Design a protein around this nucleic acid. Structure first.
Ligand SMILES: [Mg+2]
Ligand SMILES: [Mg+2]
Lengths: 143, 95, 354, 43, 74, 80, 49, 19, 53
RNA sequence: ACCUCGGAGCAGAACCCAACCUCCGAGCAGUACAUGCUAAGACUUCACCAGUCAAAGCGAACCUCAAUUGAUCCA
């Protein structure tokens, strides 16, 4: 009989991230006819405008996890243009650091056929792979 | 179906259902699905596996052949090297 | 039967009588942009958002924290224009940009980023992991003050600590070095807490590394109420996020409710509620900084269970619910022979009365 | 004796698979090359 | 109808639940894959400022994945 | 008790200790359980069979794990 | 059952047990014309023996 | 459904050219 | 009599077989297939016809 | 004249619905050879025969069309 030895049968963790890190959380299956695949936990979306370039990792519920932006003064003070291939590989390299800072080791990114064929996105894909981030998840565990 | 014979006056089981079906002592009957040996080339893989799997029988057609068969085929049989031993009995059946 | 539409139906503001003069969807990208901003907008009909979207209250979260300094947007914008105009005027950037051979210093961008707009992003990261909803039951703040922490492994290398990092207990077995960029006359406070570390009750936090009355950046003379003890993430419990937070102690305050003896590893003493703790002690000060990391089970965790904490180690494990099966039916039909195996408890055989 | 002669027969043909497999892909490539050679005349 | 929230699709265009819980119906926007030409060229013919919707079935997961239970206190 | 077992040799003993750190008790005893069958004899059977398989190999998702360890290693470039 | 029948005392453990001593004890019926060439032991009952 | 106010939300043929 | 059904045999001597359709005019075909016994893709050659379709 | 199967109206809105009622069709074709093995849970042409969808796992990569067809014994 010790107070520290007192333990409950069930352990209640109020961290939703505990399940997905253990590969146990449920990923929203469906939307097979609709283009953005919901089979993920952390998706990245690129917005290549005619003025700037944006990239932000988001959760399945539409909530933002971490973001990298060319509009940010810290990033553009060192670029010649806000949309060149240098900007796409640089924003990919710094986003890899941010993902590794926020514990994001795995994530999903679905490019279109023209987006994947673009050399900038290819070098962007090469960027975080050198940084240490892969664009693939393990399959779900259950039985 | 041949309720009383002529030489002894007893029920007579036809060997048809013997070749087609099999009994578990709980009162259940199984069968191999038909069409499992014909035109397999055109069937999708999901179909032929559905044909290869066994299937139970409704209570009516099971009751029908039960009227046909005799008590000799309904007894308990303890076979050796028989995978149906786990299934002759029933477990966790309510109502 | 038909009913009128409650709200304004879509494709109603447009006109059909004029159709050819209208500009069309030139590309798939233009369509999804319209579809996306439509999705974030609200709609009266039942939608996917109102089912799986957190039920945030309409009132904005309360945050009596450090406001931003009054930066002259006029001079700030002019200084920004001075930097880009000389950047474009440079000569070497033309070749480097069009030949794709340039780069950028990462740590330098990180240093200026966290000073400019980091606290807003760190605030966004904090509410994602759930720091504010678990600590203050919704109330937030902005960690304006930077915060660096390191675990000195040996003497050469070290493990950093920033928002959302994994940390080993073997490296977290000692006390870390801390710097928070303040020379600023008055005192400060720091505490290290575990949110999901408690096991007997939810919404309860432990405290491992508390310091109070820290004048300036120097950390040595800062007295400790709760001495050091590493965390103890149990095997199978999952992952526990450890939270740094820091306040602006305007004037010294006593600690009687909070005072604890020599460490003695009593979890009943270590446990408390940050909500009531903030309401009593921290009415004179406000939050100034924030950071956190994550920890997992390791050999040193097993070491402190048997040796330090003076208790048996727990062993948890994730157990899924059983596989559902329908009610049995004594005459199945068109089901495979393993219908019995779906309900049988003992895989082994048995004979009743023999 | 029945299982041994067939197993070593399988092991015999097993070692022969990578050679004929490499020949198999080359057949499809030679048919691919022959396809380009003939449809150019069809055009 | 169309899938969503743990609802698969068979080759015969039949919808089926994947999680255990309650079924829900809603209406959301429909963006096809680039390979669906008849649907891709359709949305290009549409005028900007107008959007089409479609029905979507959604299953609400009732219970969680599981629970952490004590195995041994050693 | 593991270290007290004289029938096990020295190199095999600590090998089981470091490779099966999960099962050792606070008091130093190795704990092992089995509930596959209803027969305690068969339960005791596969119990010692697992122990026999353990000493033999001692005398002789992980993909995801090593990724994060590589991510953690390439993150900690920091000098004093 | 073997533990049960010896506790009842119908078959004596002092003498060698046999199918004759068993069927003389009416432990289990047997129908040789129903083609059953004997009796098997069953693992159910490992405890209390 | 027809009776509900959400009717006519998914129809799209009235935008595109009819042929 | 456009197509023709043909069987193929495992060259390893295992005896695994199946069937597939073929055109009456096209030459003999040799394709890979996953043998459940050998448990990897292996080449099968088709020998004769069974029925027209 | 028809006898089997599929689609549309009759049957407008969960399901089903006939008429020697009104129309259009089918008894194939094409591409792979994991078009491999197993497995939760359900629907089902108003019975049955049949016909269907499929998570996950082993093992691997990194099917389209609407009917497009046929039981038992026997060979
Ligand atoms: Mg029916
Ligand atoms: Mg699967």
């Amino acid at each position: 009989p010790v107070e520290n030895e007192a333990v409950a049968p069930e352990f209640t963790n109020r961290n939703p991230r505990n399940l997905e890190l253990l590969s146990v959380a449920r990923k929203e299956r469906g939307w097979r006819t609709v283009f953005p695949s919901r089979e993920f936990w952390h998706r990245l979306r690129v917005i290549r405008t005619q003025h700037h370039v944006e990239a932000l990792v988001e959760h399945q519920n539409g909530k933002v996890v971490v973001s990298a932006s060319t509009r940010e003064w810290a990033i553009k003070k060192h670029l010649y243009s806000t949309r060149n291939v240098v900007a796409c590989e640089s924003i990919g390299r710094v986003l890899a650091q941010r993902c590794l800072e926020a514990g994001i080791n795995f994530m999903v990114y679905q490019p279109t056929p023209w987006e994947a064929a673009s050399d900038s996105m290819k070098r962007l894909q090469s960027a975080m792979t050198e940084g240490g981030v892969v664009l693939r998840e393990p399959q779900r565990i259950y039985e | 179906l041949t309720y009383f014979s002529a030489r002894k006056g007893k029920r007579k089981t036809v060997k048809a259902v013997i070749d087609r079906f099999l009994r578990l002592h709980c009162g259940l009957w199984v069968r191999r699905k038909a069409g499992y040996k014909k035109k397999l080339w055109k069937k999708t893989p999901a179909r032929k596996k559905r044909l290869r799997e066994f299937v139970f029988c409704n209570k009516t057609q099971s009751k029908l052949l039960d009227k046909m068969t005799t008590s000799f085929w309904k007894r308990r049989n303890w076979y050796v090297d028989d995978p149906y031993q786990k299934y002759h009995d029933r477990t966790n059946l309510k109502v | 039967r038909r009913t009128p539409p409650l709200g304004p139906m879509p494709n109603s503001d447009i006109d059909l009588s004029n159709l050819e003069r209208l500009e069309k969807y030139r590309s798939f990208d233009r369509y999804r942009r319209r579809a996306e901003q439509e999705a974030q907008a609200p709609h009266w009909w039942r939608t996917y958002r109102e089912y799986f979207g957190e039920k945030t209250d309409p009132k904005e979260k309360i945050d009596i924290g450090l406001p931003p300094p009054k930066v002259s947007r006029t001079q700030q914008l002019l200084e920004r224009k001075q930097a880009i105009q000389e950047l474009r005027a440079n000569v070497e950037e033309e070749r480097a940009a069009r030949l794709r051979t340039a780069s950028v210093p990462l740590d330098a961008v990180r240093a200026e980023w966290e000073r400019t707009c980091g606290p807003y992003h760190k605030q966004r990261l904090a509410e994602y992991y759930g720091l504010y909803r678990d600590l203050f039951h919704g109330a937030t703040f902005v960690p304006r003050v930077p915060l660096h922490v390191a675990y000195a492994v040996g003497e050469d290398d070290l493990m950093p600590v920033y928002c959302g990092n994994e940390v080993t207990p073997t490296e977290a077995a000692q006390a870390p070095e801390v710097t928070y960029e303040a020379e600023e006359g008055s005192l400060w406070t720091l505490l290290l807490t575990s949110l999901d570390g408690h096991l007997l009750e939810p919404d309860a936090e432990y405290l491992h590394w508390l310091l109070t009355n820290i004048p300036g950046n120097r950390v040595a003379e800062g007295q400790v109420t709760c001495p050091y003890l590493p965390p103890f993430p149990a095997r199978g419990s999952g992952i526990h996020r450890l939270a740094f937070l820091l306040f602006k102690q305007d004037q010294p305050i006593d600690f009687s409710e909070d005072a604890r003896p020599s460490p003695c590893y009593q979890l009943a003493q270590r446990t408390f509620r940050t909500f009531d703790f903030y309401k009593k002690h921290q009415e004179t000060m406000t939050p100034a900084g924030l950071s956190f990391f994550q920890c997992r089970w390791d050999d040193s965790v097993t070491y402190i269970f048997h040796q330090l904490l003076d208790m048996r180690e727990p062993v948890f494990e994730f157990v899924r619910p059983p596989p559902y099966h329908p009610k049995q039916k004594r005459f199945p039909h068109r089901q495979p022979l393993r219908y019995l195996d779906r309900y049988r408890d003992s895989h082994e055989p048995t004979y009743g009365i023999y | 004796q029945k299982r041994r002669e067939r197993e070593q027969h399988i092991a015999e043909c097993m070692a022969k698979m990578p050679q004929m497999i490499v020949n198999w892909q080359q057949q499809q490539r030679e048919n691919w090359e022959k396809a380009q050679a003939d449809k150019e005349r069809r055009a | 109808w169309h899938p969503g929230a743990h609802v698969g699709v068979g080759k015969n265009k039949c919808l089926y639940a994947l999680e255990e819980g309650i079924v829900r119906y809603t209406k959301e926007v429909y963006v096809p894959h680039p390979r669906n030409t008849e649907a891709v060229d359709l949305i290009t013919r549409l005028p900007k400022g107008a959007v089409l919707y479609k029905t979507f079935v959604h299953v609400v997961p009732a219970k969680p994945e599981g629970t952490f239970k004590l195995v041994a206190m050693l | 008790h593991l270290a007290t077992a004289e029938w096990i040799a020295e190199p095999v003993r600590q090998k089981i200790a470091i490779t099966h750190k999960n099962k050792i008790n606070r008091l130093g005893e190795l704990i092992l359980t089995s509930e596959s069958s209803r027969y305690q004899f068969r339960n005791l059977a596969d119990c010692l069979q697992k122990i026999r398989d353990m000493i033999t190999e001692a005398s002789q998702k992980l993909h995801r794990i090593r990724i994060e360890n590589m991510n953690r290693e390439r993150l900690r470039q920091k000098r004093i | 059952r073997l533990q049960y029948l010896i506790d009842l005392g119908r078959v004596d453990p002092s003498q060698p047990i046999d199918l004759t001593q068993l069927v003389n004890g009416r432990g289990v019926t047997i129908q040789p014309l129903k083609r059953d060439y004997g009796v098997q032991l069953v693992e159910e009952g490992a405890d209390t023996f | 459904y027809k009776t509900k106010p959400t009717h006519g939300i998914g129809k799209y043929k009235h935008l595109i050219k009819a042929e | 009599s456009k197509n023709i059904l043909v069987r193929m045999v495992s060259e390893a001597g295992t005896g695994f077989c199946f069937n597939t359709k073929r055109n009456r005019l096209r030459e003999k075909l040799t394709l890979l297939h996953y043998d459940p016994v050998v448990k990897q893709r292996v080449l099968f050659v088709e020998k004769k016809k069974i029925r027209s379709l």
